[PDB]
Amino acid sequence: VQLQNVTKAWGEVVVSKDINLDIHEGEFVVFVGPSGCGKSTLLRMIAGLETITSGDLFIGEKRMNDTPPAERGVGMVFQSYALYPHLSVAENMSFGLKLAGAKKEVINQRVNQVAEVLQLAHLLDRKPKALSGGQRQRVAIGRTLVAEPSVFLLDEPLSNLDAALRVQMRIEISRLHKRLGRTMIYVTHDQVEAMTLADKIVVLDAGRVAQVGKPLELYHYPADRFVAGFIGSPKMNFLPVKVTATAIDQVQVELPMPNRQQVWLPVESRDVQVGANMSLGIRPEHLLPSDIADVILEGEVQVVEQLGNETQIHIQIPSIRQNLVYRQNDVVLVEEGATFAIGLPPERCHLFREDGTACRRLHKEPG
Amino acid sequence: VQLQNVTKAWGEVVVSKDINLDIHEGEFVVFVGPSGCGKSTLLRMIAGLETITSGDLFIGEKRMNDTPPAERGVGMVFQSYALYPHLSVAENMSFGLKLAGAKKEVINQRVNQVAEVLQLAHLLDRKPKALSGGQRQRVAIGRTLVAEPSVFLLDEPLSNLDAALRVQMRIEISRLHKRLGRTMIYVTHDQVEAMTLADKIVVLDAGRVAQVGKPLELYHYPADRFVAGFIGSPKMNFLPVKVTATAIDQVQVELPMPNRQQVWLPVESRDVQVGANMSLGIRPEHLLPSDIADVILEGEVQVVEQLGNETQIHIQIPSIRQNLVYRQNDVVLVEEGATFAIGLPPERCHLFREDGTACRRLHKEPG
């Protein structure tokens, strides 16, 4: 699967601008982004269920822009797929692949096989009705699974399933993905899942492609502020700062804290001017405990949540409008109003220009 | 609010055993549990929507089993509300707090306030009927989001809103619980949410009230196997162990691995006999990094999930069917098939009899 200049609009309303994705055979790619990143359309644009008003689309190799959906070699499942009311569970799950199958021999084999793996063995001879809504969805998945299509299109397939089932299926997915080394494209909002399944994640924004790379690549090296703010749940912290000096691959910034402290960051230094107001990023998880000074940020506690395995502390700081979110392991016992101190590790700070573009971090991160 | 021996079913096949909840006022209470635990039904059963085939229900102070819906003294804006295609948005999010209430201090202060932290302001009055693939939601639920009844009753609200207009809600609903010192009954599958919103949590399993208490009390002192395995994800690790000795504030067990190491655990010891086959539980976040050699577990790395802020390692252990997940902060690079060693802390372990009943931990957890 490959895309070259793919574009789509409705007169002027654009929802897919110049996208070029080069998906290699066997790769498990994951599409992420917010509300209208248009990540679903694009999945649909690939299956044919949506028109491509420009550019090219190849699958297998041959151009596919005008190939009816059922002939592209792709398979699909999404949110709450509807099964065939009259067909039994076993009848479903086999529907596809039946549509060109080596008779009961193969069908009645991939079925029961893929059945066990989805904890459905004891439902084979039943109807879509008198069946849990969580099992129905698993059935929907099964079909695509026994068909072993050339390319799997998955759109938040486990959305239905509840925590403590979605983990089992999130695993069966990879297992299957490994056995049948066929290409797979997945869409979600569950960032763990993404980081867990993907070989490559494509982050979408405004219909455009914000960035593509391996999981730990987008995490340690966001290409811009949008991606920095998008990958990672207790969103990265951004502190307005002013640059006070630049040297070969260095660049010094003046923090918002009183005593106007200056800190040198190991970053690209390319398109950065002395006096330019830029942004600094620091993930809640990378903020130091304070027992390690060297640039300390102090403020007053606003919120405090006990997750039981960790503790997120919302800290306010005069000369920092927005709060600073912090993550510390286990149980820290601090009440609201109390005063809290944390540390700022320079080798883990990001620096974005007004442009919003990142100043290539130079700290070699493992992995 | 409060319940007693409430039994729900139809005439024989139960769907809600003798539950005896007791919800003081001003208390934010969350219901959690797997799929068909019935946590939902019970919700409706409180708001009348369901016939309580037994028991009693004291909303406020007066029984209300027979007392029809509307007239109850509650609130409750279910999952996805049904708008009014005809009545423009100038005729939405009200009805209640309309036929009465001082002139303009009803739909100006109370009503007009929720469309605040949802970007809402573009839908002030514009007819919702066939707007966007998710714009009539704002003009569906909030239809009764303000009347300040005696007790609220929600059900899996913020679910189709990305890690955006949902996190803020967990910041707003809890805010309303500040001003409106009223009572609420939230229901979800978002464990962080539950843990971050409730003052008290009831965990239901097959219409059975598994246990009730504060967040950290369910995390630190689960009443039994069910609850220890349900709160927290990844799930708690469980190992089969045989009890070799007992005292009046200990209980000794024999780990599975070779050299059958024995360890004394700080637990109840009440109903436990030498020889019994019990289950030891230790949370992945609590396993230790082996440089602390007092009772170690060693195995071959199977899975290694890199989440960016942490790293999860699945370790296959000899003479223990299932693997053993381990959570560690940061990167930690480890290839599969490798040999890994972790620390197993006696304070942090749990112990369950065949009953699945937990042997009360005697160590006091701070918090």
Swiss-Prot record, chains A, B:
Please name the InterPro entries in this protein's record. AAA+_ATPase (IPR003593), ABC_transporter-like_ATP-bd (IPR003439), ABC_transporter-like_CS (IPR017871), ABC_transpr_MalK-like (IPR015855), ABC_transpr_MalK/UgpC-like (IPR047641), Mo/tungstate-bd_C_term_dom (IPR008995), NA-bd_OB-fold (IPR012340), P-loop_NTPase (IPR027417)
> Which positions bind ATP?
G33, P34, S35, G36, C37, G38, K39, S40
Mutation: G275P; reported impact is: Resistant to inhibitory effects of alpha-methylglucoside but retains transport capacity
Would you tell me the Gene Ontology cellular component terms?
ATP-binding cassette (ABC) transporter complex; ATP-binding cassette (ABC) transporter complex, substrate-binding subunit-containing; enzyme IIA-maltose transporter complex; maltose transport complex; membrane
Q: Does the keyword Translocase apply?
A: yes
> Mutating R225C: effect?
Resistant to inhibitory effects of alpha-methylglucoside but retains transport capacity
Q: Which PANTHER family does the protein's record reference?
A: MALTODEXTRIN IMPORT ATP-BINDING PROTEIN MSMX (PTHR43875), MALTOSE_MALTODEXTRIN IMPORT ATP-BINDING PROTEIN MALK (PTHR43875:SF3)
What protein does this entry describe? Maltose/maltodextrin import ATP-binding protein MalK
